Structure 1
């Protein structure tokens, strides 16, 4: 019959990296997680306790609870035609801080600095990002760069 065990189809997902087996480095256990931090989930195959289910591999959530060796993460899961909130009790070895927003905090700091320096001098602070714009006009010189003519090559075998 069919098999739908807890760790089914996880042959490669939970493997260690090549030449990266063994004990976990100490910086994993020294990081500090607080309620409200954004973390991403990546199960470590050598730690069988506090291991997330395979569905949450590669998912990002928000910490809501902090315990002795584990944290609680909030995950929104799409079930049917709606999203339901899932609460996971995961050990710290299976998570890490998310860099998707640490850079955003830098832009928040930079916006305030540019907002303040323009507060006394210039109107229209212009603190909004823009997408890539079409290129402006330019002049290309041929001094030492005379164009060289190219032609299609004939067919050859060279086997």
Structure 2
């Protein structure tokens, strides 16, 4: 936009409020999702690992299963069906 990495223009998504700062609580990380379950994908700024591309933030997909510790979530980004590999930390149950 000048330039095209993932992290471009994600100053805002990637930043936490000063209050929210600090290493994130452990519950959100442990969280368990079931397949057919729809999960919201939101990057937790405080947790480095498990992250998706930041462009995806605000998306709602369905957990199709898991690879290793992470979960594999199906989303449709525009026309294309995509797979986003994301840890439970950056996932929240819908509803």
TM over 0.5: yes
Q: Which runs of 4+ in 1 moved over 6 A?
A: none
**Residue of structure 2 equivalent to 1:45:** 45
Runs of 5+ unmatched residues, structure 1? 100-159
Calculate the aligned-residue CA RMSD, in Å. 1.7
Q: TM-score, normalised by structure 2?
A: 0.87
Deviations 1:38-97 (A, max 9, x none): 00011011222221112211010000022443111101111xxxx110001101111110
1:113-132 residue CA offsets vs partner (Å, 9 max, x unmatched): xxxxxxxxxxxxxxxxxxxx
Structure with a larger share of its residues in strand: 2
Q: Is the 8 A contact 1:33 1:66 kept in 2?
A: no
Instruction: Select the structure with the greater relative contact order (CA < 8 A; seq sep ≥ 6).
Output: 2
Larger of the two Rg values belongs to structure: 1
In the alignment of these two chains, the number of paired residues is 95
Q: Larger % of helix: which? A: 1
Q: Which residue in the other structure is 2:80 paired with? A: 84
SS in 2 for 1:89: strand
- TM-score, reference length from structure 1: 0.55
Work out the CA distance in 2 between the residues paired with 1:10 and 1:63.
25
